[model samples]
Target chain A: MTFVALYDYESRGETDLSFKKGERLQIVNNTEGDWWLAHSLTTGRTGYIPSNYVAPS
Target chain B: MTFVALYDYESRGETDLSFKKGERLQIVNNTEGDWWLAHSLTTGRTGYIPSNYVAPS
Candidate 1:
């Protein structure tokens, strides 16, 4: 099952990090980043992105 | 880090199930229940609780 993801940061600018349109990510360390970090579940690489861009599947 | 937890359920009533005031829960499987499930991280037991009742610390 897919899960809802969100971007969270201390500042709004830190929160606005974006993903390429249509980019997909795997999630890692759901505990640390407040849902703002998305790992390329496929690649296992992680990046910062906006929370609004993610949703549960 | 404490993460912002939210109540997400297939239905709102399912989401509003309450926890006793000051009850502490350990989080397990952050993936499965949206944000409404709170495990006693201390006890390793899990249960459903309202999302609004939890906040990032």
Candidate 2:
């Protein structure tokens, strides 16, 4: 799956995915939870993010 | 615990927390996992987000 970020996100630690506004991301797992595991196409890092921070693309 | 957002985040669904850059959040739970349950001071909504998205404040 794929998603587009509505806002810019910077990782505070090594486990988070950092991205920019309108950035595209490759979603690896989006189960019915508050967090979704994803891979940032721009950063090439895989991590979890807020499921609500993005929209399906 | 408290944290500051490194980026902006908008909720796509009801089960997520919507916040902005530099927003302060009250962490209700942050265990050793990819997700952390947090309460946004700006939105007054509680949800889980990436543990690395915010740093301890």
Candidate 3:
């Protein structure tokens, strides 16, 4: 699923995904409770991101 | 990093992990782009999850 970032989230951890607000994010997996596997269309970078930081695009 | 889930998410993908809200999620790897390697401390199940759904524990 694709989503729009609701806020700018910098990757704080090595496994964390980073994104700017309003960036296009593609969620590849979202099953482990709070973490989600996603890629940023803006950067072509993918990692784990907080689900609340994005809304369905 | 270990995180606490802010919301509940169920694993749908064959490689995905599942957990309930407030559960402890341990991140093993986020190097696989959007797909992460992790396990739930509460459920003892390991898999991938969205990073957004969790907060620092």
**C-alpha RMSD over true interface residues, each candidate:** 18.9, 17.7, 16.1
Alpha-carbon error at B28 in model 2, in Å?
Answer: 1.1
lDDT of 3 by residue, B1-57 (tens): 445556655554344345555555444555433433444443343434344533343
lDDT of each: 0.29, 0.47, 0.46
DockQ, 0 to 1 scale, candidate 1: 0.03
lDDT of each residue in A1-57, candidate 1, tens digit only: 112223321212321222222222223333322323333333333333223233443
Write model 3 residue lDDT over A1-57, tens digit each, in one string. 444445555554454455555544544444433545544443343444555534443
lDDT agreement of model 2 with the native: 0.47
Clashing pairs in 2: none
DockQ of every candidate structure: 0.03, 0.05, 0.06
TM-score of every candidate relative to the true structure: 0.21, 0.30, 0.32
lDDT of 2 by residue, B1-57 (tens): 334446676555443455665544443434433564444444343444454444443
Stretches of candidate 3 off by over 4 Å are A1-57, B36-57
Docking class of 1: incorrect
Off by over 4 Å in 1: A1-35, B1-57
Error of 2 at A11 (Å): 28
Q: Docking quality tier of candidate 2? A: incorrect
* Candidate ranking (TM-score, best to worst): 3, 2, 1
